[PDB]
């Protein structure tokens, strides 16, 4: 079975996040709810590795559910946007209502079986299609939540592109 998705982040065949076409509705709501309340959210100042909050995405100037990854200098923190998959450095953090923290992350961490692969060529191939639909076959869900899959692009297991 193949699931429609959008590869939003891609650091390699071992580490890349995607968004399932089915979590799109919920994510769309998360966005409305976080935009409808963005301005009234109190400042979140407990910056510690792992903490959940709502951080501002430099490109958008928009706040998204995020998880702090590292504490840098002068308020700056490397955050991870759980519903997307990309990272960023920002200084703008706000509290995350517990009702809007209950939902699961809407982007899924993935990887292809290293056992079947042996890279800058595929990287550009994926990024050149950031705005296009792919397909995943979830072969398993690793113990840490990371999916092990096979990536398709209009029916070509992109694995054909790996030597």
């Amino acid at each position: 079975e193949l699931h429609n998705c959008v590869v939003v982040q891609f650091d390699g065949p071992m580490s890349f996040y995607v968004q399932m076409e089915s979590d799109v509705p919920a994510l769309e709501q998360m966005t409305d709810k976080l935009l409808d309340a963005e301005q009234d959210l109190p400042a979140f100042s407990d910056l510690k590795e792992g903490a959940l909050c709502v951080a501002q995405f430099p490109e958008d100037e928009v706040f998204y559910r995020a998880q702090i990854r590292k504490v840098l200098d002068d308020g700056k923190c490397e955050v991870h946007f759980i519903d997307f998959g990309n990272n960023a450095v920002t200084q703008q953090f706000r509290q995350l209502p517990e009702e809007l923290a209950k939902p699961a992350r809407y982007s899924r961490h993935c990887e292809l079986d290293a056992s079947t692969i042996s890279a800058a060529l595929l990287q550009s191939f994926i990024d050149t299609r950031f705005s296009e639909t792919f397909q995943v076959e979830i072969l398993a869900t690793k113990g840490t939540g990371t999916h092990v899959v096979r990536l398709f692009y209009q029916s070509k297991n992109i694995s054909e592109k790996l030597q």
Partner: peptide, 7 residues
Amino acid sequence: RGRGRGR
């Protein structure tokens, strides 16, 4: 990119 970016 992605979805539900909002802007």
